Amino acid sequence: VAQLTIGNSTITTQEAANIIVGYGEWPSYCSDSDATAVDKPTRPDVSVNRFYTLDTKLWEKSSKGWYWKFPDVLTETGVFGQNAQFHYLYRSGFCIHVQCNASKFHQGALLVAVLPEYVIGTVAGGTGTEDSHPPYKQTQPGADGFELQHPYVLDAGIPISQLTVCPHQWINLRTNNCATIIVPYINALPFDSALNHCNFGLLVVPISPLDYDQGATPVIPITITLAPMCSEFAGLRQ
């Protein structure tokens, strides 16, 4: 076990941890992009690229699952939120670290997966004629994240049983307690809007329910820590 420190933020994680890099590609600055000279977009590395730790979630016997949208999850938090809100164009990678705190007498399994372009589809009651489109709070839930209504179909008509085709990692309370996923910038464009486009959604869903004998702590905390990799912002000001 060791001390991991970037910027002014310091977290406690384990040396003995297996990292999964999404699609085998590390996040990178877009020397890629044609638009240069003049001039290259502001890039914040030392200060903005720190450990942002979201308010933990409490996962219960009855929990269905949660999701967070990126970068929406941070466009209301720190200096990342400042840059994302007051710039025109944006692109970045992410280091997502999901960790549980449970005892050896608890049990359960979490599927932590990343789904690029995670579009939500809510209902009107089964079925038409015409549609309810989901509100802001369900499509861009902010740093609090939103809770899944129908996990089996991922709130979008697609089976969760195949979610492992996405960059994922299991949190088996018996085996591990943390999962780390690295996500590079994925888009049909080199730059996009930070506030109107969510490049991917993070999913943390119980496949095997939390269980414990009566007397053990009824709620097990899920702590999400995330850190921007290769941020890039273009534009000015308000």
Partner: protein, 223 residues
């Protein structure tokens, strides 16, 4: 050999994508013309197929099989006009859109073999995308509503405007069936395959009465 499971082979074939009725009398297309926005999902099984991935690039080969509702071949001259993304479509049979040179037109006889043309990769982006988690830009400010969600506008591929040549209505009832074949397919970011019925064309909405893929089993122990 594994060439049958390449994306090119998976999408290779030409399928019916649109039917155009041009009746003598009726309410269908009274003005002897029709505008058909290019719809990849005109062919039923294609959407679920195509939605296995998030981003895609492809060419499209369009073939136009025309005849009367009996399958009869008649001496009629047709015009197939391709209205590119951003160009205005014809609103009448006398619209000047029909003679705009920047709208590629094909003039075929119903007697001739089926017409055939290729449409390049039209998107301004580097790839089409069947899923767009976000509201269309420009951003923000508020916006005004929720309605625009999940709609990517860079998937616009064009429009085919089908009419009979001439100033007078045709003497024949016509059906123009149009077929699309995907060439040079590339795709990115695999997704779980749709397991709930579709409800609407432009969003992943599902009935709140959701079903298993299958489940013909009483207990886990008996086969």
């Amino acid at each position: 050999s594994t060439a049958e499971t390449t994306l090119d082979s998976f999408f290779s074939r030409a399928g019916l994508v649109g039917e155009i009725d041009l009746p003598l009398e009726g309410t269908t297309n009274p003005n002897g013309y029709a505008n058909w926005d290019i719809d990849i999902t005109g062919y039923a099984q294609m959407r679920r197929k195509v939605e296995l991935f998030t981003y895609m690039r492809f060419d499209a080969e369009f073939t136009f099989v025309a005849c009367t509702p009996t399958g009869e071949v008649v001496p009629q001259l047709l015009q197939y006009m391709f209205v590119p993304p951003g160009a205005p479509k014809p609103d009448s049979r006398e619209s000047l859109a029909w003679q705009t040179a920047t709208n590629p037109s094909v003039f075929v006889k119903l007697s001739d073999p089926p017409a055939q043309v290729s449409v390049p990769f039209m998107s301004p982006a580097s790839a089409y995308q069947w899923f767009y988690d976000g509201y269309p830009t420009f951003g923000e400010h508020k916006q005004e509503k929720d309605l625009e969600y999940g709609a990517c506008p860079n998937n616009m591929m064009g429009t085919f405007s089908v009419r009979t040549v001439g100033t007078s209505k045709s003497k024949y009832p016509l059906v123009v069936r149009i077929y699309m074949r995907m060439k040079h397919v590339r795709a990115w970011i695999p997704r779980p395959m749709r397991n709930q019925n579709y409800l609407f064309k432009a969003n992943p909405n599902y009935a709140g009465n959701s079903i298993k893929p299958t489940g013909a089993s009483r207990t886990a122990i008996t086969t």
